[PDB]
Design a protein around this nucleic acid. Structure first.
Ligand SMILES: [Mg+2]
Ligand SMILES: [Zn+2]
Lengths: 158, 141, 47, 39, 150, 183, 37, 55, 53
RNA sequence: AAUCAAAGUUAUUAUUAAAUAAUAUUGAUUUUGGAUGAAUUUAAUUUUUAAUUAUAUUUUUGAAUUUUAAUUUUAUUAUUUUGAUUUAAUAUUUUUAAAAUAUUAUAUAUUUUAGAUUUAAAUUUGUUGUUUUAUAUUUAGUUUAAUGUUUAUAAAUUGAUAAUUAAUUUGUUUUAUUUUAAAGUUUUUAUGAACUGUGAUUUAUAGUUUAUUAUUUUUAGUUUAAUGUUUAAAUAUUUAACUAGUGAUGGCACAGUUGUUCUAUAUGUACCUAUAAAAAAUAGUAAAAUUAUUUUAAUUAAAUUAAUAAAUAAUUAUUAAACUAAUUUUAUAUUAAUAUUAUGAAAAAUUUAAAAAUUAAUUUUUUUUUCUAAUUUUU
RNA sequence: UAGAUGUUUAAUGUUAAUUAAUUUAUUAUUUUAAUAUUUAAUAUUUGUUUAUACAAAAGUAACUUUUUUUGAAUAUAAAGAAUUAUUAUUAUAAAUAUUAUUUUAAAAAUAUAAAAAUAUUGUUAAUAAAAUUAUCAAGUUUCAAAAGCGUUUAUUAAAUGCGUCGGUCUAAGUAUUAUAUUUAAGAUUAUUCUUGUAUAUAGAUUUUUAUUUUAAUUUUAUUAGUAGCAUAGUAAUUUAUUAACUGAUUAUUAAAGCGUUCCAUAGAAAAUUUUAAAAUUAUAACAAUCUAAAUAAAUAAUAAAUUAAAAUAAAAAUUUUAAAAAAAAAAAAUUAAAAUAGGGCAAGUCCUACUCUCCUUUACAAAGAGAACGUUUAUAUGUAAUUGUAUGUUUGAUUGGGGCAAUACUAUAUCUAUUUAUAUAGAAAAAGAACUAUAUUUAUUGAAAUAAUAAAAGGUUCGAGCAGGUUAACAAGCAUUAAUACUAAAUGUGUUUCAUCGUCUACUUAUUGCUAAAUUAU
């Protein structure tokens, strides 16, 4: 059967990112970019974005909302209490121009690239036209299973 | 969720506009034949004929076999009873007069004198009370 | 009789008979209850 | 066990008593299963 | 609507009461005649006294064998009475369903063949018994489950 | 209807006093007081029953993946009755089975009766064929097969998330097998 | 003393609402076989 | 009961020496020299010292 | 207010000891029923004249 | 001993409801058939999932009613892409949960004791608080339009033709509403023969009296009695009686103006008034109710009639009226128009009647601003 | 003070153009629905000790890994009374398991009775069919009334059942047969006479009685008869008993038994006689099990109480009030200790019944088809027909318009008589006219208890009435009101009544009530 009403919507309250399109319109915030919190807590705290979890529109803004972490450890290693910057929302964070250093609105544009024709969706400020590209992710260096991988030259044999 | 929280989620019959009555219903015909209402404004007798004028005549008094012939008023205690069914047309409107017994000539057209009937050529200016319509000599059903 | 011991019931209970199944076969078919069109008669047995 | 409620008519006149004979209202929206067949 | 019969008012109304009569409907009771059933006899009453063959025998499309797992509206009333009631054979042992977790006729392995008295089953069709026949690559060109990276 | 002659007319030889079928005349169907519950099997006990009644959609959802249904015309019924029909061809050559082995009976304790789990629709003689031709197992004299209601539980949210059901098949190998675990 | 209040009477009142498949099987012309014409 | 009782009816309950003596009486006690636990007189422990010489 | 007959105009929430016939003149006049319960209605006493009226 | 008047704040969590909108619609919640089909069939000239701009006619005299509106022309069966719009509604759960004044031989809370008492509503048909409802808290709880500003105009009459010196208003057409709760019923079709009827269904698991296979009977579940009396039970405990069924708790079979009946108007799923379903039946004709303090003109009546009270007078009421001799320089509620579910008058004065009261009678028929003053005294 | 001679809301309350103290004043004495109390210091609850079968329905709150077979497949512990409750679910089979849920220091009642002298029915409507017992658990007899042995929702001269008999049936069942009934077997007998249904019938009705149905009012012969027998009654006699409203006998005009009567008659219900354990009167006589407290925490009911007592008057009522004047646990006198039955009236509906009311009606008859059979008509209207009426007022009669009775009139008391019967269809077509209705005049028959009912009030049993006991004082059919029958048992009470001074009889018949009459004397 279904739940008790405020626990019915507690199920909506606890996991609000399960509704589709809870992820915002084409992504604008990536790791490391210039950012500061304007609303909520500590207005005017300039930080770099450490890590981003997308599906829920959440970001680890460094040096802001650093929440004391209760790290759980085994008998092997002794636990520690070190604080980490807690996943903080983005609806209350904006961008400061890496050059101008003032609160800028960062939005997408399509730009014909130079020597390549991707027309990749490029972020641009609405005041400075700061052409900020989308950062390219990294292929993990130490990835790969040694004993259970068919080699590409051995797996692409047409 | 509020009115009954389960009686209003599962659905029963929904009610709609309720049709009206024949809004000259209360000029019933046991007056449109028995009486006739005479009089100037603000005094309308309902004059009615004699009581004993068809049943037993032989032997009744000589000068009372004729009191049955005059258009006597009906006593006002009944005027107000019968004319009560006619007042109800728009109550609480202290300045509309009661419906009349017979249909006065100007109100019959008052129905078709309305801004919505101006496009019904038939049934306008009196077509019911008109003489019977004349048709093509070939008219046939 | 003023005493219904109600223990003479309860012995050799009847099958469950799940009458919702025949109630369903009616709707899962065009026919209503087979109104006295048949209504029935006891059919013979092989014995 | 069942009942037609109409009562089996003579084998010669197979239909007496249509439900319309009684001024019955059987709109599909009123009692549901209504709409007759002789129609 | 009792009179959906061939209209014959002064003559005798053939069959009138019999098994095969008209004016009784189509999806009626009184159709014991129609005992002809595609499912083999032995799977609706066991091949022997112990009700051996009894059950619901799903079958593979290709297999010519016929099983009694029907889903026609006329046949589900008995296919549930197998899954929830089960059969109490007249020999004393309860058949196809005897305990708690009611079987899933549609997740049975397919009927492979009619039972025989001498052995158990004449395996009438083996084309229903899958024999996974993938060659084991021990000769050359080794293939791990998933591929390498750039 | 309520008053007047139409009230008394019931005495004046009128059985059926009609209900006012001009008032509710908003024509949208009510629903009966013995209201039906939806077709979803609410139960998640061990006596959960398979619904035999065939649903319309389940056929349509079958076609659209068998052959592009609204767009690609059907394969001729001869091919569909043939072992060369793709889902009969994707099966005869690319089986899809999950014969998972339970280790709690084949761990450090030696066993002659290692237990498996096989999909509910793998009969005995197929489990033989399977281990024989895929895992080289060549010594299986008797297999012993149950059927278990898939595990059930309540997730932290609260919906009863019952896993699929399976089929314990305690095979009985000749020479016992074992697994070592060095700590 | 009715019987069977249990779960099978709790499914068989919920799963049987499932609408069976419908195919307009139109009447078979038994006596007038059309293909033998 | 053909009437509900106001508190002044429920309160008369607490005046007789039946309520008082049943609920509202403190028990006379003292410290068992052997067990150091509070104790009434005439009652002892399940213990050799407490059982041979009544503390 | 409730213009109860035979008793002025009463307030709402007032006393309904005397509205025995206001609760009975709110239902409305009998519909389809002779207004005159006894005494041979004055219409029936007078004679039909001029068959149409 | 006895009283003693007494605590208004949880704390903490977020995108449903309802109407509306005139674009889709072969039956929502696994994978027909899986023999090869015969088994997955709902269709017919009637107010129908089709929903219609008048007051005149005409009519069993009395619940019956008005005809294309522009001929495919738009009144038409409806949502995603503004948390889809709008306006009305607003929560539901988790855990919150508090408090210090009046005697000392007794009527009822005021500090200064004494004075003080219908609890209300109805019902009172003045058989005049007439034996009815209410434990308390909070929430929810009942629909007659209090208004007429310039285009603009109405108004009668015969039975009928007609006649209209016959004298005269108003109105840019005013309509819609009509209490609330409550039956037994009543009709319209769907479900039920697991209880119980009857149909059918079992061909020999204990005792015994008698010559007898018939027949007395062991007889622990059942014609009685106690207990129980919201009980361990919406029928159980103990117990009396009875008990001999080759003819019967039982395959499936009969269903509601009807089945069944060794017939009792009995039963056909724990009140047979079947259940289930769909209505707005009636209930003003002594049922229960009908929500807003501080106001600003009074009263009773009692007759014609009733296959016995919805109707009439008279009263009351809402709205409105004009100053005819009589007097003082007194004093005067008279009316019109509508609204109106009523038959019976304390103490007298008398009058019918075995009244043993009823009946006639006809004058009564109480709503206190506060401080104060006063002429009628349980001598 | 304060407009005035008493019943139709006051609102720019964030300027519904709001923006940090709006301090919102507006809240229905009952209704349901949700909570909370009272009953409740409680009613229930309470876990100390152990006599074995296996099926199927039924469940699935359900854990899992465990070694089923040599079958493919398939599935093996758990119900129903709302519950973990009264509760062996008896499909089978078996017979020695040291299988294992029951608080506790008392006497009242009460459920209950071990034990125990007399007495034996005097108790009571009535003793005797009334648990178990190792003290081994059983009354005998007579008479009168009474059939079959099956079967029943208030459990039986209920209804079955065999035979006989009446009727029907030779193109679906065997006419010593099977339908359709009435009776009841067995044994005696089964009487007199017909006005209607039925049959037969002849265009039909109308007529019309071989047998059958129903009838016999003085049928009344046989036969039993104060009897389940309309009153009269306790029938009058006889017994029987101390006492005979018992019961049995004789006969015998029995309010109107009667031939399907009567006899015969067995376990039944009575009446004797008699015996007898239930603790039957006398009669009272705890051995047993059923604490408090500690714990868990329900129910009816609930306007309030500081009054409640008590006495007295009352006035409409039973008294309850008003007034005066006082002054913890058992029991059931009062509050409503009760439920719910018992009335009767009103409007409403229900259900059944028949010479008179009326349809849907399937039968009978006519006609039409060269009548090949189905339909349609016409005339008919059936209780087979399920519609509606069957009153109102005073109590059972009356219904009209007058008059006399103080220009009062309940029907009071008396009488009169062209005092007139309005409308609508028909009838009379000029001005003139007929018919009929509770005579103000709306409807289309008359009857029932149907276990009648639902929504209401209101009485049979009374602070006041009425008619039939030696004539007259008295049982007691209408003005109130959950008081919810008479009597008995038990248990009280205030009176009042001659000289101390006064009020305890027990029985028989019937349980009606109160007498009769037996015990000396009552
Ligand atoms: Mg409220
Ligand atoms: Zn100690």
């Amino acid at each position: 059967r279904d739940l008790e009403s405020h626990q019915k919507i507690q199920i909506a309250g606890r996991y609000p990112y399960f509704s589709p399109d809870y992820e915002i319109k084409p992504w604008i915030w990536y790791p490391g970019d210039t950012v500061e919190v304007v609303s909520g807590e500590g207005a005017g705290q300039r930080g770099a974005i450490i890590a981003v979890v997308k599906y829920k529109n959440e970001i680890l803004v460094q040096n802001v909302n650093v929440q004391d972490v209760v790290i759980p450890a085994s008998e092997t290693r002794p636990e520690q209490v070190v604080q980490r910057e807690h996943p903080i929302s983005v609806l209350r964070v904006r961008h400061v121009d890496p050059s101008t250093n003032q609160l800028c609105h960062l939005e997408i544009v399509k730009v014909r690239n130079k020597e390549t024709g991707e027309l990749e969706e490029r972020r641009i400020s609405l005041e400075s036209g700061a052409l900020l590209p989308i950062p390219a992710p990294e292929e993990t260096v130490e990835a790969g299973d040694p004993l259970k991988d068919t080699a590409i030259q051995d797996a692409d044999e047409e | 969720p509020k009115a009954g929280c389960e009686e209003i989620t599962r659905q029963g019959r929904r009610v709609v506009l309720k049709p009206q009555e024949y809004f000259a219903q209360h000029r019933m015909q046991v007056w449109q034949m028995r009486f006739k209402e005479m009089g100037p404004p603000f005094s309308r007798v309902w004059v009615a004929l004699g009581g004993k004028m068809r049943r037993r005549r032989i032997g009744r008094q000589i000068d009372v076999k004729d009191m049955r012939y005059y258009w006597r008023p009906i006593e006002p205690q009944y005027q107000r009873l019968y004319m009560s069914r006619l007042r109800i047309k728009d109550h609480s409107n202290k300045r509309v007069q009661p419906m009349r017994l017979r249909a006065t000539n100007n109100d019959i057209g008052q129905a078709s004198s309305l801004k919505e009937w101006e496009r019904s050529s038939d049934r306008k200016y009196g077509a019911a009370l008109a003489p019977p319509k004349k048709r093509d000599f070939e008219f046939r059903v | 009789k003023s005493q219904h011991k109600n223990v003479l019931r309860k012995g050799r209970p009847h099958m469950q008979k799940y009458k919702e199944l025949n109630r369903w076969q009616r709707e899962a078919q065009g026919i209503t209850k087979w109104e006295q069109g048949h209504s029935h008669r006891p059919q013979p047995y092989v014995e | 066990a069942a009942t037609p409620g109409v009562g089996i008519a003579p084998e010669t006149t197979p239909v007496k008593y249509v439900p319309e004979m009684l001024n019955i209202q059987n709109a599909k929206w009123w009692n549901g299963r209504g709409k007759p067949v002789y129609r | 609507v009792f009179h959906n019969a061939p209209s014959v008012y002064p003559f005798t109304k053939p069959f009138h009461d019999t098994p095969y009569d008209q004016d009784r409907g189509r999806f009626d009771k009184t159709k014991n005649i129609l005992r002809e059933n595609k499912w083999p006899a032995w799977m609706d009453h066991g091949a022997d006294g112990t009700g051996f063959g009894i059950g619901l025998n799903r079958t593979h499309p290709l297999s010519k064998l016929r099983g009694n797992l029907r889903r026609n509206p006329s046949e589900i009333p008995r296919v549930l009475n197998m899954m929830i009631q089960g059969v109490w054979h007249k020999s004393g042992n309860k058949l196809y369903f005897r305990g708690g977790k009611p079987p899933n006729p549609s997740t049975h392995p397919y009927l492979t063949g009619e039972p025989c008295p001498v052995y158990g089953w004449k395996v009438t069709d083996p084309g229903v018994i899958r024999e996974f026949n993938l060659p084991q690559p021990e000769d050359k060109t080794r293939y791990k489950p998933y591929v390498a990276l750039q | 209807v309520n008053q007047g002659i139409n009230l008394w007319r019931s005495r004046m030889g009128r059985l059926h006093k009609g209900w006012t079928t001009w008032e509710y005349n908003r024509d949208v169907i009510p629903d009966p007081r013995p209201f039906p519950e939806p077709a979803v099997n609410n139960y998640f006990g061990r006596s959960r029953i398979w619904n035999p009644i065939a649903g319309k959609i389940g056929l349509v959802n079958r076609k659209a993946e068998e052959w592009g249904w609204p767009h690609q015309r059907p394969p001729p019924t001869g091919l569909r009755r043939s072992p060369e029909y793709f889902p009969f061809f994707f099966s005869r050559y690319f089986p899809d089975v999950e014969v998972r082995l339970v280790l709690d009976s084949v761990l450090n304790n030696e066993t002659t009766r290692p237990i498996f789990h096989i999909p509910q629709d793998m009969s005995k003689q197929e489990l033989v064929n399977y281990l024989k031709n895929i895992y080289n197992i060549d010594n299986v004299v008797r297999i012993r097969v149950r059927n278990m209601r898939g595990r059930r539980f309540k997730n932290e949210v609260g919906e009863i998330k019952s896993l699929p059901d399976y089929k314990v098949a305690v095979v009985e190998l000749d020479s016992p097998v074992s697994i070592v675990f060095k700590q | 003393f009715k019987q069977g209040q249990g779960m099978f009477s709790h499914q068989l009142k919920r799963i049987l609402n499932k609408k069976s498949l419908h195919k307009y099987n139109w009447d078979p012309l038994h006596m007038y076989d059309p293909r033998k014409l | 009961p053909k009437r509900k009782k106001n508190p002044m009816q429920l309160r008369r309950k607490t005046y007789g020496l039946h309520f008082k003596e049943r609920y509202l009486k403190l028990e006379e006690w003292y410290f068992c020299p052997l067990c150091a636990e509070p104790k009434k007189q005439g009652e002892w422990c399940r213990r050799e010292d407490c059982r041979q010489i009544k503390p | 207010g409730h213009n109860v007959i035979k008793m002025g105009w009463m307030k709402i929430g007032g006393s309904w000891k005397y509205s025995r016939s206001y609760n009975d003149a709110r239902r409305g006049f009998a519909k389809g029923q002779w207004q005159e319960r006894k005494m041979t209605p004055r219409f029936m006493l007078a004679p039909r004249v001029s068959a149409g009226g």
